[PDB]
Amino acid sequence: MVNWAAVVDDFYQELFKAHPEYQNKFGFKGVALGSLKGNAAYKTQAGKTVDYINAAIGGSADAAGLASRHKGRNVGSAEFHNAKACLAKACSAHGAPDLGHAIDDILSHL
C-alpha cells in the first residue's frame, strides 16, 4: 500500500515553507515547521488530508463540498494553484502516484 501519510507530511512542509502566511489560518499557527509532527492540531489536519486523498482515489470524494468549505475560510483559486505544485513535489519524492486530477476537480468549483 502507498504510504500517503508520508506524502502528506512532505506536502505541508513544502506549502508552509513557500507560503508561511497560509499557516496563520490553522490551529497550529506560529509552530516551527520541524515541530509540526508532534503537534495535535497538525496531526488532525494531516489525517483529514490523507482521508480526502484515499477518498478521491477510491471514488467517493466530495469536491464541491471541499471547495465550498475553503471559500468559507476565504481560500480560493490562487492558493490551490500553489498547493497543486507542492503536492506534485511531495509525490515525486516518495515515488507515489500523481494527484493533479484530484486537485483540478476542486479548482473547477472555485
Ligand code: HEM
Ligand atoms: C492539496 C490541497 C488541499 C487539500 C487536499 C485540503 C484538504 C482539506 C481538508 C480535507 C480539510 C478538512 C475539511 C473538513 O473538516 O470538513 C481542510 C481544511 C482546511 N483547509 Fe485545506 N486542503 C488543501 C489546501 C489548502 C490550502 C492551500 C489552504 C490555505 C490556507 C487551506 C486551508 C484550510 C483551512 C484554513 C482549513 C480549516 C482548518 C481548521 O478547521 O482549523 N487548505 N482542507
